[PDB]
């Protein structure tokens, strides 16, 4: 625990869409395990269920495929078929408004879940505090 502990309000009772203000893309986990972002609100792979394993520590799962959002050893996001240490994220409030997700496994290096303006996933090392890429707003499905 070497990070602040400002947590977002709201809960995990219902699924959500993770909207990235950077380019206005929703986080998407495709059936093949590919992760990206899309602006198409009618997409069936943007509905995500978050669950708290510990206070502030969550899994982010696709309701359509059951895949878990995860970040690999080189900082790339991917969809995992089963839950593992690369699937846990530190969900925190940011700028008193947005939600950010830091890779628990790579928390010491501040690797965040993040989408570039063109909708492509940002690599762990390339993310950092202060970018719009890491800022999410969980919206109702």
Swiss-Prot record:
Record note on what altering residue 91 to A does: No effect on integrin-binding. No effect on integrin- and heparin-binding, loss of FGFR1-binding, defective in inducing FGF1 signaling, cell proliferation and cell migration
InterPro entries cross-referenced by the UniProt entry: Fibroblast_GF_fam, IL1/FGF
Result of altering residue 120 to A: Decrease in LRRC59-binding
Motif window: Nuclear localization signal: 13-16
Binding positions (heparin): 22
Keyword Cell division: no
GO biological process: activation of protein kinase B activity; anatomical structure morphogenesis; angiogenesis; branch elongation involved in ureteric bud branching; cellular response to heat; epithelial cell proliferation; fibroblast growth factor receptor signaling pathway; lung development
Major subcellular site: secreted
Pfam families per UniProt: FGF
Effect of residue 122 to E: Loss of CSNK2A-, CSNK2B- and LRRC59-binding. Reduced integrin-binding. Defective in integrin-, heparin- and FGFR1-binding, and defective in inducing FGF1 signaling, cell proliferation and cell migration
Domain of life of the native organism: Eukaryota
Similarity field: Belongs to the heparin-binding growth factors family.
Assembly with partners or alone: Monomer. Homodimer. Interacts with FGFR1, FGFR2, FGFR3 and FGFR4. Affinity between fibroblast growth factors (FGFs) and their receptors is increased by heparan sulfate glycosaminoglycans that function as coreceptors. Found in a complex with FGFBP1, FGF1 and FGF2. Interacts with FGFBP1. Part of a Cu(2+)-dependent multiprotein aggregate containing FGF1, S100A13 and SYT1. Interacts with SYT1. Interacts with S100A13. Interacts with LRRC59. Interacts with CSNKA, CSNKB and FIBP. While binding with LRRC59, CSNKA and FIBP seem mutually exclusive, CSNKB and FIBP may cooperatively interact with FGF1.
Protein name in the entry: Fibroblast growth factor 1
Organism: Homo sapiens (Human)
């Amino acid at each position: 625990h070497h990070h602040h502990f400002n947590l977002p309000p709201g809960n995990y009772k219902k699924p959500k869409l993770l909207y990235c203000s950077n380019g206005g893309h929703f986080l998407r986990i495709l059936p093949d395990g590919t992760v990206d972002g899309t602006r198409d609100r009618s997409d069936q792979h943007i509905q995500l269920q978050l669950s708290a394993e510990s206070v502030g520590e969550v899994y982010i799962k696709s309701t359509e495929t059951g895949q878990y959002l995860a970040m690999d050893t080189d900082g790339l996001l991917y969809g995992s078929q089963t839950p593992n240490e690369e699937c846990l994220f530190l969900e925190r409030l940011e700028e008193n408004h947005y939600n950010t997700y830091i890779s628990k496994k790579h928390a010491e290096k501040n690797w965040f879940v993040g989408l570039k303006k063109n909708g492509s996933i940002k690599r762990g090392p390339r993310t950092h505090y202060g970018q719009k890429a890491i800022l999410f707003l969980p919206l109702p499905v």
